[PDB]
Structures are given as C-alpha cells and as structure tokens.
Coordinates of C-alpha atoms and ligand atoms in Angstrom, one line a residue:
X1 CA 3.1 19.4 -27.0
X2 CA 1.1 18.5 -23.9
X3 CA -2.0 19.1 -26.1
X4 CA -2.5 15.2 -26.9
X5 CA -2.1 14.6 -22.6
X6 CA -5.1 17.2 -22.7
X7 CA -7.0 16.0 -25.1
X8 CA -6.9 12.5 -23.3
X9 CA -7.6 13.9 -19.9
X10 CA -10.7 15.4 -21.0
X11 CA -11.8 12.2 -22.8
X12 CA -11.1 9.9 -19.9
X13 CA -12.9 11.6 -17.9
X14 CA -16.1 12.9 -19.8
X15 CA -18.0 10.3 -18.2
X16 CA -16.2 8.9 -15.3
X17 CA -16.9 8.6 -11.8
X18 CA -13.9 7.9 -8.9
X19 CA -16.8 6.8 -6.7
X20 CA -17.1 3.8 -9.3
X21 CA -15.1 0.0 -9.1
X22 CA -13.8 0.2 -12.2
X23 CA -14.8 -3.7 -13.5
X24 CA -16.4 -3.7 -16.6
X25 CA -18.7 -6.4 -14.6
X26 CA -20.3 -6.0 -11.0
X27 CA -19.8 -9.6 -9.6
X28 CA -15.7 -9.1 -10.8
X29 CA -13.0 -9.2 -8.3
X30 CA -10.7 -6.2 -8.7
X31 CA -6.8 -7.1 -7.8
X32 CA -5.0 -4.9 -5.9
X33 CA -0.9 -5.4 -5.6
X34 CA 0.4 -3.4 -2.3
X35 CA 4.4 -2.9 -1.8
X36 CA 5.7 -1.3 1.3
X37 CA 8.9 0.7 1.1
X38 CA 10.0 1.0 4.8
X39 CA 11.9 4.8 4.6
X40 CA 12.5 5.3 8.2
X41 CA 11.6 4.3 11.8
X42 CA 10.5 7.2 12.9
X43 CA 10.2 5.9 17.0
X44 CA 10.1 3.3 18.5
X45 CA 7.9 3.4 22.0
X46 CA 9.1 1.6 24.5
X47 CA 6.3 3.0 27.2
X48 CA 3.1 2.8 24.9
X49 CA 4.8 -0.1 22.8
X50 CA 3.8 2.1 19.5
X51 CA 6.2 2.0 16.3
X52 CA 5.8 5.4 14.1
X53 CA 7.1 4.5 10.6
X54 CA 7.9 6.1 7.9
X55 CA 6.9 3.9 4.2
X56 CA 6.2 4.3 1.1
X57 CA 3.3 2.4 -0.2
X58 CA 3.0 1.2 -3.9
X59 CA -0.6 0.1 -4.9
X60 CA -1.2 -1.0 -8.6
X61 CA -4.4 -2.2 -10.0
X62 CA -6.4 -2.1 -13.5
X63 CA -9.0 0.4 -14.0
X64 CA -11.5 -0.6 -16.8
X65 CA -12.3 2.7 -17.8
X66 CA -9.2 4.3 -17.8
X67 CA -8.2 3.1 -20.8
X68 CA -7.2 4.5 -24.3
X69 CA -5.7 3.9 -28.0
X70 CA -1.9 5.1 -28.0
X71 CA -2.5 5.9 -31.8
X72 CA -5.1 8.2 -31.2
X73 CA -3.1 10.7 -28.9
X74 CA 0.0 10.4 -31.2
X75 CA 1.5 7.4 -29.4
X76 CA 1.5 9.3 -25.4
X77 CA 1.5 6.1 -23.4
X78 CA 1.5 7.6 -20.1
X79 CA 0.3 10.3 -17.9
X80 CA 0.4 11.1 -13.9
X81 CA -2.7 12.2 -12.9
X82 CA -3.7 13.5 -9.4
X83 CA -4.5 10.5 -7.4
X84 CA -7.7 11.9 -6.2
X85 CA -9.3 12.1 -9.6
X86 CA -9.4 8.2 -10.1
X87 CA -11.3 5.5 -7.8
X88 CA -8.7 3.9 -5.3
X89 CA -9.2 1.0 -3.0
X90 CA -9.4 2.4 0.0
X91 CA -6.3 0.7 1.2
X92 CA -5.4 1.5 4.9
X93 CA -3.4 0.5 7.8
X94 CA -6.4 -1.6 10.0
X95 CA -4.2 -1.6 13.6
X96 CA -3.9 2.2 13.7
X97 CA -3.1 2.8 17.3
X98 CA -3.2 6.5 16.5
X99 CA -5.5 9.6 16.8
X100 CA -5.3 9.9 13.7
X101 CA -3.1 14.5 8.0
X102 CA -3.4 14.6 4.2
X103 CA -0.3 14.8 1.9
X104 CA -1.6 14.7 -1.9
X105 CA -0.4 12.8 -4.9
X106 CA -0.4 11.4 -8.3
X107 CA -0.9 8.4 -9.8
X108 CA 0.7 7.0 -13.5
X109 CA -1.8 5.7 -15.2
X110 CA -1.1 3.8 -18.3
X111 CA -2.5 3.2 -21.7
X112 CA -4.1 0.2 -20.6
X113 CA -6.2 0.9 -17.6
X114 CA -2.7 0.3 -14.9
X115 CA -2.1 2.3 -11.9
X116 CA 0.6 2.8 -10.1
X117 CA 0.0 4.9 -7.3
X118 CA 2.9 5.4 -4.6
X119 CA 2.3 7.6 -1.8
X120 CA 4.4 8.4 1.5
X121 CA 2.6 7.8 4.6
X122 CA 3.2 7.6 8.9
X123 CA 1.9 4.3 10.7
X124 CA 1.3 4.3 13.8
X125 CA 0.7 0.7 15.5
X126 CA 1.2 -1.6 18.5
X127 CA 4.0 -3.9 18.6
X128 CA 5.1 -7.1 21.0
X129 CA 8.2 -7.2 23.3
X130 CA 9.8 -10.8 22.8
X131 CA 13.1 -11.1 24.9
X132 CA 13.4 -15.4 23.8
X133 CA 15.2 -14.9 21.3
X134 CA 18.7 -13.0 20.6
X135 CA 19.6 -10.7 21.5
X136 CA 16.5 -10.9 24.0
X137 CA 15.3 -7.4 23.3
X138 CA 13.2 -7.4 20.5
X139 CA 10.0 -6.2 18.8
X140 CA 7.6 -7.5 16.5
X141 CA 5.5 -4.6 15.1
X142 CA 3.0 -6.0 12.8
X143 CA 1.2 -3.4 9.7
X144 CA -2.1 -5.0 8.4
X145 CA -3.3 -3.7 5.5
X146 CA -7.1 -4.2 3.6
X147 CA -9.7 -2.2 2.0
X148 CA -12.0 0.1 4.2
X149 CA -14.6 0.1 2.0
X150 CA -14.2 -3.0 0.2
X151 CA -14.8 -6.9 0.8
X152 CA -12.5 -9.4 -0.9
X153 CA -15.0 -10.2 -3.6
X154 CA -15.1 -6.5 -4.4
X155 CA -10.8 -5.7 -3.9
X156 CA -8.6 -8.4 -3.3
X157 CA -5.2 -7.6 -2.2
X158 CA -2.2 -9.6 -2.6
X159 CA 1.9 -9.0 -1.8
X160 CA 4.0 -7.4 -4.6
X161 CA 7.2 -8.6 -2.7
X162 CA 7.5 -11.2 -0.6
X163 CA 8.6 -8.7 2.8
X164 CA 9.1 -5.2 2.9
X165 CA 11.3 -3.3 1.1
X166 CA 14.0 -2.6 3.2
X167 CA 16.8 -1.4 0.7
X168 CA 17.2 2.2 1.5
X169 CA 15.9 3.5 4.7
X170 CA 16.7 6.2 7.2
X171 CA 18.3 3.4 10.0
X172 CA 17.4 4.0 13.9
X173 CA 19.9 4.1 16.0
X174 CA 18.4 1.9 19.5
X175 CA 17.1 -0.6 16.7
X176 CA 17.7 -2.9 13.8
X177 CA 15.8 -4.1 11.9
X178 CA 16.0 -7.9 11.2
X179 CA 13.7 -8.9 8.9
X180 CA 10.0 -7.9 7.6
X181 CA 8.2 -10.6 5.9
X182 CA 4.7 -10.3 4.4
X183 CA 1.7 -12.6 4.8
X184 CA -1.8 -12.5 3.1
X185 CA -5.0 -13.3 5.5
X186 CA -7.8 -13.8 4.4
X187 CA -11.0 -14.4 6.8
X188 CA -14.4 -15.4 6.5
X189 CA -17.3 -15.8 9.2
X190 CA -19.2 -18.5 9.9
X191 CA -20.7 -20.8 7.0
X192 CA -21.0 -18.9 4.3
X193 CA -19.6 -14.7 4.5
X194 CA -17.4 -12.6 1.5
X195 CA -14.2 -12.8 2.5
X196 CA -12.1 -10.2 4.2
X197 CA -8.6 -10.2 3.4
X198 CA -5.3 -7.7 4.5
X199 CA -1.7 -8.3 4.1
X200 CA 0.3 -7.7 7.1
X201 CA 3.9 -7.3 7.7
X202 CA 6.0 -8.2 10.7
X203 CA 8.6 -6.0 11.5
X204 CA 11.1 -7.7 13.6
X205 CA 13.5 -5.4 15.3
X206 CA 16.3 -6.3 17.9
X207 CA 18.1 -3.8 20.4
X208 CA 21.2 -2.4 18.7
X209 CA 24.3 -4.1 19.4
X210 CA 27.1 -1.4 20.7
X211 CA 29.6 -4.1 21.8
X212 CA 32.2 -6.2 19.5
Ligands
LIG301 C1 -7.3 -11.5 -9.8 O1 -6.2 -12.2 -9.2 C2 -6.0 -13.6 -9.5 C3 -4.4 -13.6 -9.7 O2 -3.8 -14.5 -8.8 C4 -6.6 -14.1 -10.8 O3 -6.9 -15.5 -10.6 C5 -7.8 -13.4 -11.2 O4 -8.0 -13.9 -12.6 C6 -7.7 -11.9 -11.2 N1 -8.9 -11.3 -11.6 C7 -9.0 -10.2 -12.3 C8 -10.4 -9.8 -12.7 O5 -8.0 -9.5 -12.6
LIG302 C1 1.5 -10.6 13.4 O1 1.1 -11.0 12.1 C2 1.4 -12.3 11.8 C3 0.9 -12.6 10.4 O2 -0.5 -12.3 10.3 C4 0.7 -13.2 12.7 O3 1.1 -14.6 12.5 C5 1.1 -12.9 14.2 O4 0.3 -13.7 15.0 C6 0.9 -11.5 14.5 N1 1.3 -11.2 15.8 C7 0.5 -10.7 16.8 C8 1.2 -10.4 18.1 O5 -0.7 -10.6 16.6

C-alpha cells in the first residue's frame, strides 16, 4: 500500500525544481532551524589546535511547494524522501580548517511543506587554548554555521536549542566537555548591506581530571 506514497511523489514533483527557494514570494525570508547533536569527539589536536567532531545536524524549514491534501492520498501524512531531491539551504560549517566526503540521506517531509532533515557529518575547526580558568587546560572550539549560497534575506537561520545537544555522545577520554552554548550573529557591512547571519557554538572542553 505504498501506492498513495507513489502517487504523491510523482505529483510533488511534476513540476518542481531543488534548485528553487521554495517561498511562494521572491522578497520572502525563508527560516531555517539548525540543531547540533554532538555524537563524539573524534580528536582533539593539541599540535595544529584542530577539534574533529563527530554531530548530528537537524535542519528544519517549510517548503512552499512541497505541500499536499492528506485526504487525497488516503490520509499518508508523511514520507522520507532522499534529501537530494528537495532544495536545502546550503547550511555548512564556515571555519572549516580542513582539506576538505559525501554520506547520503533522507529527509521527512510532511503534509504541510516541513522538513526535517538530519544528517551525520565530521567538523573539522580551530579552537583556542585558555589555561585562566579551571582546571587551566582548556579549549574553546567554536562551529559557525550559515548558508553558502544564501544571504539572511534569502535563509535566516536561527538556534533550535539553546547549546548543543550533549545527551548521548561517544565521551573522549583526555577531554570533557563543559558546556556548548549557542549564539546567533548576524552581520551587516557598512550603511546599508543584506545581512549575513550563522549560529555558532562554543565548545568548551577542560583536560580530564584523573585525580580525587
Ligand atoms: C521567519 O522567522 C521569524 C520568527 O522569529 C518570523 O518573524 C517570520 O515571520 C518568519 N517568516 C517566515 C516567512 O516564515
Ligand atoms: C567563539 O564564538 C563566540 C560566539 O560568536 C564569540 O563570542 C567568541 O569570540 C568566539 N571565539 C573566538 C576565539 O573567536
């Protein structure tokens, strides 16, 4: 009974293009809701000063075009759809200190234009040594995170969560991690530009303790 999920993928996308911001109007802003899900710290390098994380990113947005009458598919409210048939936006980590390969997806795209899209990925980044505060061997790794394509009147992005998620990760054994709170920044140049915005995360680990 997958026959209604067909019938709706081929009407969605009769006429759609994932090249496309899907506003139903030009000069509309589209929203963009970003979670990271902090699954591992993968290393941390103390020569280059370069954190390799592992997270799971969560986007969710409205598409405009995406959107259909539960009734007419005999009420199928939901369907996952690989990620790189819709328009995304272009969400990536800015301080890449990397190189910098693919790993493919789905998204869930509901009845009224939502999708959720979460999708593993590897960060590589620069961080700063503090040593003023306790325990005196620390890092701050900051993640920033926009639109490569997009300015903010185009995609705006804003925090699902007010830090990272840090309920179930891998745990690294020189570091822990003491907090990751999230900030919005938005920056615009000179008089009169668009805006540019990013959310960016602090990680904030300390030296592990192996004392008592
Ligand atoms: C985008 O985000 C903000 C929510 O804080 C809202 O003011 C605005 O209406 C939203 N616009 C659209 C088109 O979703
Ligand atoms: C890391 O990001 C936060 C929030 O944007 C910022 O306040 C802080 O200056 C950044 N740290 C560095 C070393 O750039």
């Amino acid at each position: 009974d997958g026959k209604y999920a067909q019938k709706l993928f081929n009407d969605l996308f009769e006429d759609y293009s994932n090249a496309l911001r899907p506003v139903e109007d030009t000069d509309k802003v589209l929203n963009v809701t970003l979670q990271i899900t902090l699954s591992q710290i993968k290393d941390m390098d103390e020569r280059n000063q370069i954190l390799t994380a592992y997270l799971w990113i969560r986007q969710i947005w409205h598409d405009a075009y995406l959107t259909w009458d539960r009734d007419q598919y005999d009420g199928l409210d939901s369907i996952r759809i690989p990620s790189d048939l819709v328009w995304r936006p272009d969400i990536v980590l800015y301080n890449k200190a990397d190189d910098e390969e693919p790993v493919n997806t789905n998204v869930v795209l509901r009845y009224d234009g939502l999708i959720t899209w979460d999708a593993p990925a590897i960060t590589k980044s620069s961080c700063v040594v503090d040593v003023t505060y306790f325990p005196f061997d620390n890092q701050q790794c900051n993640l920033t995170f926009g639109s490569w394509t997009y300015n903010g009147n185009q995609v705006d992005i804003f925090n699902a969560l007010d830090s990272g998620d840090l309920s179930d990760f891998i745990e690294d054994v020189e570091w822990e991690v003491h907090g990751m709170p999230a900030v919005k920044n938005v920056i615009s140049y000179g008089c009169c530009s668009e805006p540019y915005p990013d959310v960016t995360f602090t990680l904030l680990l300390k030296r592990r303790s192996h004392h008592h």
